[PDB]
Amino acid sequence: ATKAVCVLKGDGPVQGIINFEQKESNGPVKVWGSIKGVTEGLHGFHVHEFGDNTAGCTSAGPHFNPLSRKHGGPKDEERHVGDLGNVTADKDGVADVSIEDSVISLSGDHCIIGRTLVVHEKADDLGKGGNEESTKTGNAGSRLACGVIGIAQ
Amino acid sequence: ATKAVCVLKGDGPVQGIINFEQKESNGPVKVWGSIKGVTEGLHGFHVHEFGDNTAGCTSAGPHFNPLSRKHGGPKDEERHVGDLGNVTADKDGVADVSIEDSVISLSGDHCIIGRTLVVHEKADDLGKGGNEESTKTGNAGSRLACGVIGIAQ
Numbered sequence: 001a002t003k004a005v006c007v008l009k010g011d012g013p014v015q016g017i018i019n020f021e022q023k024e025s026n027g028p029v030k031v032w033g034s035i036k037g038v039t040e041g042l043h044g045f046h047v048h049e050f051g052d053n054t055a056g057c058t059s060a061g062p063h064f065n066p067l068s069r070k071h072g073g074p075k076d077e078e079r080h081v082g083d084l085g086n087v088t089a090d091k092d093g094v095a096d097v098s099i100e101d102s103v104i105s106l107s108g109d110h111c112i113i114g115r116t117l118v119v120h121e122k123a124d125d126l127g128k129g130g131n132e133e134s135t136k137t138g139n140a141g142s143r144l145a146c147g148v149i150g151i152a153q
Numbered sequence: 154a155t156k157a158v159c160v161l162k163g164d165g166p167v168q169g170i171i172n173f174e175q176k177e178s179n180g181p182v183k184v185w186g187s188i189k190g191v192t193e194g195l196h197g198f199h200v201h202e203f204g205d206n207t208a209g210c211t212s213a214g215p216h217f218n219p220l221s222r223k224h225g226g227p228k229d230e231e232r233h234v235g236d237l238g239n240v241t242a243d244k245d246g247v248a249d250v251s252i253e254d255s256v257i258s259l260s261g262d263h264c265i266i267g268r269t270l271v272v273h274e275k276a277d278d279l280g281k282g283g284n285e286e287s288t289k290t291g292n293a294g295s296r297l298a299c300g301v302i303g304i305a306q
């Protein structure tokens with residue numbers, strides 16, 4: 001069993017804690033936790049390529065895309081490795097996150113450790129938005145909060 | 154040509170940016186950057202095991218010690234992989250960091266990506282302090298600032 005963790009921080013405050021667990025290196029990653037301080041509704045949720053927060057979340061770069069694919073949703077074959085969909089916030093501005101993903105990993109070439117988890121301003125259209133930007137970013141807008149994914153006990 | 158980065162922050166005024174570069178698999182890692190808001194003098198400087206900031210720097214756990222050694226200085230055979238010695242701050246409270254180390258790596262089983270870099274309250278005695286804690290923590294005291302080490306562009 002392999003474990004990772006990420007503390008999300010952004011202005012608001014937007015605060016999040018997200019845990020990752022992978023029982024076996026050829027198996028799925030469960031992702032769970034909570035994010036508070038965001039508006040009710042959908043917020044895009046992705047792994048970005050670099051664990052660089054030197055000048056904020058912008059420093060993380062584009063979606064983690066080791067296989068050079070187009071943007072999609074997590075259930076799509078055509079997706080970036082970092083494409084984890086949306087999290088959904090309630091009227092209290094709390095998003096409870098419960099995901100299982102078979103494409104991210106905590107070891108090997110799809111490893112997300114040392115990269116940045118980002119929660120976005122707007123909904124991710126899952127690449128179904130019918131513009132060029134949909135197939136790159138999902139039209140999810142600015143970066144509300146982020147943190148580097150680290151190895152956990 | 155492998156690169157990593159770490160943004161150091163804490164509860165108080167301590168802030169830092171530290172860059173890592175490793176030209177060759179199993180070659181030396183160059184570590185450089187700056188830390189401000191610390192007191193004049195020595196501050197212990199180590200990679201801790203976990204990239205976990207859930208409840209701040211304490212969540213990072215002990216020094217990164219995959220080979221089960223005693224605490225030492227970076228120029229010692231007997232050291233933790235995470236043992237990078239001290240940084241030294243001037244009367245300005247600024248520490249300029251310029252380190253080269255052959256024991257840490259940015260790939261493989263000595264890899265520090267996804268782990269935490271910590272700058273301490275006090276000086277690290279490099280395990281020459283002659284008490285038991287010297288051979289464990291170097292007597293460097295509390296954690297003033299820390300960050301998860303991320304993959305950089």
Ligand code: MET
Nearest residue numbers: 030031032097098099100
């Ligand atoms: C079977 S437990 C629910 C799994 C959920 N996908 C998670 O984040 O862990």
Ligand code: MET
Nearest residue numbers: 183184185250251252253
């Ligand atoms: C030859 S350059 C000086 C090495 C120094 N240790 C560094 O971090 O780059």
Ligand SMILES: [Cu+2]
Nearest residue numbers: 045046047118
């Ligand atoms: Cu994103």
Ligand SMILES: [Zn+2]
Nearest residue numbers: 063071080083
């Ligand atoms: Zn994407």
Ligand SMILES: [Zn+2]
Nearest residue numbers: 199271273293
């Ligand atoms: Zn320490």
Ligand SMILES: [Zn+2]
Nearest residue numbers: 216224233236
């Ligand atoms: Zn040590």
